[PDB]
Design a protein around this nucleic acid. Structure first.
Lengths: 271, 46
RNA sequence: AGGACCGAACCGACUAAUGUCGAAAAAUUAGCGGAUGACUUGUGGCUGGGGGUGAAAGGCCAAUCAAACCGGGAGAUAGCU
RNA sequence: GCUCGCCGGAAGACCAAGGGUUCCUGUCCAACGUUAAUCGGGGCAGGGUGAGUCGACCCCUAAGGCGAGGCCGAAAGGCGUAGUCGAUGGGAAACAGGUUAAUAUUCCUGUACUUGGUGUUACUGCGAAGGGGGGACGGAGAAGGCUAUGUUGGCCGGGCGACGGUUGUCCCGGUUUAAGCGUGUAGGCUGGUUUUCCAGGCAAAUCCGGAAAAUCAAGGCUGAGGCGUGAUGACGAGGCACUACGGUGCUGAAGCAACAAAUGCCCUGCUUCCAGGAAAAGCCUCUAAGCAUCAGGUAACAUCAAAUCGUACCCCAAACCGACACAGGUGGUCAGGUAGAGAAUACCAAGGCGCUUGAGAGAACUCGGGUGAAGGAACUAGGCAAAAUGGUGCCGUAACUUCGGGAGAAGGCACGCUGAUAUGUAGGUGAGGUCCCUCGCGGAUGGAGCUGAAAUCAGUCGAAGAUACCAGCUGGCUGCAACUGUUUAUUAAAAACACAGCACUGUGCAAACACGAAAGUGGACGUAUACGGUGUGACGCCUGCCCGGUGCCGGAAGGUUAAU
RNA sequence: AAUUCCUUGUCGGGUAAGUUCCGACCUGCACGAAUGGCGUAAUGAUGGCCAGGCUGUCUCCACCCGAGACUCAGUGAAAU
RNA sequence: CUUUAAUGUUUGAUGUUCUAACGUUGACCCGUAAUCCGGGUUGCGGACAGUGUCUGGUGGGUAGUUUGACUGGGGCGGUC
RNA sequence: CGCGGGGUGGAGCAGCCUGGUAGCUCGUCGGGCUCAUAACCCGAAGGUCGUCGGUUCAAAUCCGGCCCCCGCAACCA
């Protein structure tokens, strides 16, 4: 739940947290934990390719069963966990045969709930079924692109993909950004909205609040010398140039999209 | 002040050692050039 | 609880004096700022020259940086001394 | 050798790093030492480093490196799989005392422990590059239980003391003891046990997990310290005895109690919040491929092995790094007395030193300082520098405000010692005695002894009772910036940068973008509440008009338009 | 005004005296709305100004304590 | 010569469909205890995508250079 | 000090460029409309083209001196 802490110190006077009384406060399930080596934004070469990335806090990786291949098995939700890697919550589900797996927790899911997968499943929040078995107009998430791939659409906190129309072998979807996209019918999708939808209302407050997230200080171009950035220079704050990225590529309105091999799948571009 | 040379034999032997040279081709020539010049202090080791 | 308060270790380096063939190729003395944090430090690695890195000064990259050092083009060229 | 002085959370005592004989002894004084030098980290010669338990090597991994094949690239070579390396990480095992000119948890004495081989005896199913458990972990905060350690008392030994006194509530010194084994507590964690079943765990499974039942209420794991034992042992102040007079040999009393108490230990705990906190092996355990009169495993015993290397000395410095015997820099550990909140600080203990040029003079002037009549910033670019304020409890405290603050605002009162309340209170600790019992490291009750604030009254001394060291100057208006923070190492610390927040725009995932001739990576093992770029920079009230020029986006009919 | 050249603009307050300061008037050489505008509690080793307090900064320096300077013995440079 | 119609022929430019090139950073198996890679089944795209050669455009991201002389110092103005 | 532009009925602006004929709107006068004004409709007058001189068949126009205004410049030590 959203709470605005009391201004008892400078830096705290703007911090708003989302404190959830449903999260399991104990240690995560050890069997599904594996190390997560941080990059710092450097590639194989070691050169910084993506800036502002590094530092942060050591956060362990929790594998998640995005695939959901276990079908016709009545599973029971056990407890909700905190995932430092995903903005959404992860529910630890226990299968009927004794296998425990993590899944992206939806909106209407609590401890002690029952969910099943496959084409057998009913239309109930949390269930997974091939998209050609779902009624058009409904809303799903953790949608796959190709059958058996794993699921890639709408996996963030509070996101949801609503199915628009289904013309046989292909299913038309309206993505989150307002991008009409097609997808073959044999792809699976998990029902319901993704939980923790108030995550966007979280103002970090402190400067260091970004530092332990992994975000590193970003220097503006208008404050650099001409040999470091296309912008910059000038005695006493002067700009006068056409806004670009550090490499001359025009920003503030410039389409960089050029794939063409998957252009066939797009029905409408966002507006 | 903190002088620009805080010695540590491990690092000195790893980035300037005999085997560090014999790894890459460029390193091999450094040993080769020195042998033609006849320098006894061939590399940095014991 | 706190990028919370006073304040040693520790780190940093605003003021003045001394020093400038110095004790020292930027220090000392008397006072300072932070001091649970964007903190600091040990050990060990990765990124490299028109490249690296940079809470961004054109600062740092072994006392040398608006383009490091060493060898080679090369006895460069000089209407200049 | 007798005095004086200095450090004493170091200028002490130990390791790593890094040096490389600088360690100790004899001897030498030319060269080195900023002075002389019989002195020395200087020359010459000799001696010294003793390990199954410390560390490295070794077993196993992290960041990352190399990388059979493989992919890619004019060549060089780059990336990377299985593997194989790489600690600052985890993993078996020792302490006390004595001894040297120098080394010793290494040598000797005493008492123990650990990993394996072989053999013997009695039992019994063993067995992987495979499964599971475990290893295995965050920050901060508070309390309890203890110890290192310290003080007092009892006791033992000695003294009764060069100017007045001191056989007494007087004085000084000592009162040290581990590893291991047994007991398994203060405390923490968790419901055990048994039967059946299964799409779970790349195969199997008696192990883990899940799903049904029965029985009973506890069992088990972990755990500092204490008490015994180790130990009628060692050590031990002081004497007794020989001096090459440096020290060696001999002998040896007391050796307990009470209280205070760590930043150390239990705690790699418990609670709580969030930014949500390595891997693998050792070990335990289940089986497959197979092997079964075997081989192997469990337990006890005997014996053997535990190798190679380092080990000296310095280690907040004349030995490392700075050209020097250089006022600088160098990570970790132990860390006492009184005062004190404290690792501040003052003076001391242990311990180690007086900084490797001195002696006289007492001028100007120069540096570090003490005090200063009257005035009190009139100095000056400017209150720069000095001076002053400075602690604790209590009283009291404005404008303004985001209602947290502002604020320790400002401004004040009491602070010493002695007696009394009380032959030291409240409180803490707590034996003996009494009683019970699921009988032990137990619980109630009990209260001696020990220790010990603060408040009040009364009396008294000095000019001064926070007396020393240590230790805020305050208030008013206002520019800029929100704030913590960061920056030109070596003239600039700010109004400059960052900042959470906001906006715009890009990107539908083999994503945009970036590095790379390529592959492949980072982005992200994330996926539009995400990610890149840009601009501005908390919060509050807002953010007007212009698409002519430039850029960008959209639509393409027409004109023009390269190669072909 | 961190912007105003002209200029020490004009008026008021502060002072015996105020080219700086504070509050206003608009004649804005040449402010202005995210190269953001106007305010803002707290914060600031920040900039300007005033007052109290306190003092050798000053009026105008005076004395004393140590380290040099001076003389003597030893050693023994440097810039030019 | 113009306007034009049936046929034959010639290539060009679009649209739909398919599978064989190719792609496949989809699932599965083996080499192999290996998420690289290769081969093999299959699904999905599809003669696109992408690569090479040629070519137009944008292009300070990047590089090599130019940026006059006289002048009562130079710049400005003027001149050649 | 230099460079460019400008000065036109009462006012604000074109026409100069590439010479012979000066235009638009408001303002003014007279008339009409209305009870009266304004507005509206109709017609007309109004300009030494800053000044002086020269060149020219002809000058607002091409050139030069001067007067007034506006902008730029008046810098580097």
């Amino acid at each position: 739940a959203v709470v605005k802490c009391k201004p008892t110190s400078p830096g705290r006077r703007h911090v708003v947290k989302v404190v959830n009384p449903e999260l399991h406060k104990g240690k995560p399930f050890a069997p599904l934990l594996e190390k997560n080596s941080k990059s710092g934004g450097r590639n194989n070469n070691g050169r910084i390719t993506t800036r502002h990335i590094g530092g942060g806090h050591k956060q362990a990786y929790r594998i998640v069963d995005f695939k959901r291949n276990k079908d016709g098995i009545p599973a029971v939700v056990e407890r909700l966990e905190y995932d430092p890697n995903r903005s959404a919550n992860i529910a630890l589900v226990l299968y009927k045969d004794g296998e425990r797996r993590y899944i992206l927790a939806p909106k209407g899911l609590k401890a002690g709930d029952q969910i099943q997968s496959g084409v057998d499943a009913a239309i109930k929040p949390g269930n997974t079924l091939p998209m050609r078995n779902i009624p058009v107009g409904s809303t799903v998430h953790n949608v796959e692109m190709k059958p058996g791939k794993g699921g890639q659409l709408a996996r963030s906190a509070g996101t949801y993909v609503q199915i628009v129309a289904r013309d046989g072998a292909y299913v038309t979807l309206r993505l989150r950004s307002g991008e009409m996209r097609k997808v073959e019918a044999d792809c699976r999708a998990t029902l319901g909205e993704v939980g923790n939808a108030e995550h966007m209302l979280r103002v970090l407050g402190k400067a260091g609040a970004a530092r332990w997230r992994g975000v590193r200080p970003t220097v503006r171009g208008t404050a650099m010398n001409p040999v470091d950035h296309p912008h910059g220079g000038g005695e006493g704050r002067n700009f006068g140039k056409h806004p670009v990225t550090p490499w001359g590529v025009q920003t503030k309105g410039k389409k960089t999209r050029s794939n063409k091999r998957t252009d066939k799948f797009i029905v409408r571009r966002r507006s | 002040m903190k002088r620009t040379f805080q010695p540590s034999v491990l690092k000195r032997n790893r980035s300037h050692g005999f085997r560090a040279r014999m790894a890459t081709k460029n390193g091999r020539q450094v040993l080769a050039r020195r042998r033609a010049k006849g320098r006894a202090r061939l590399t940095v080791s014991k």
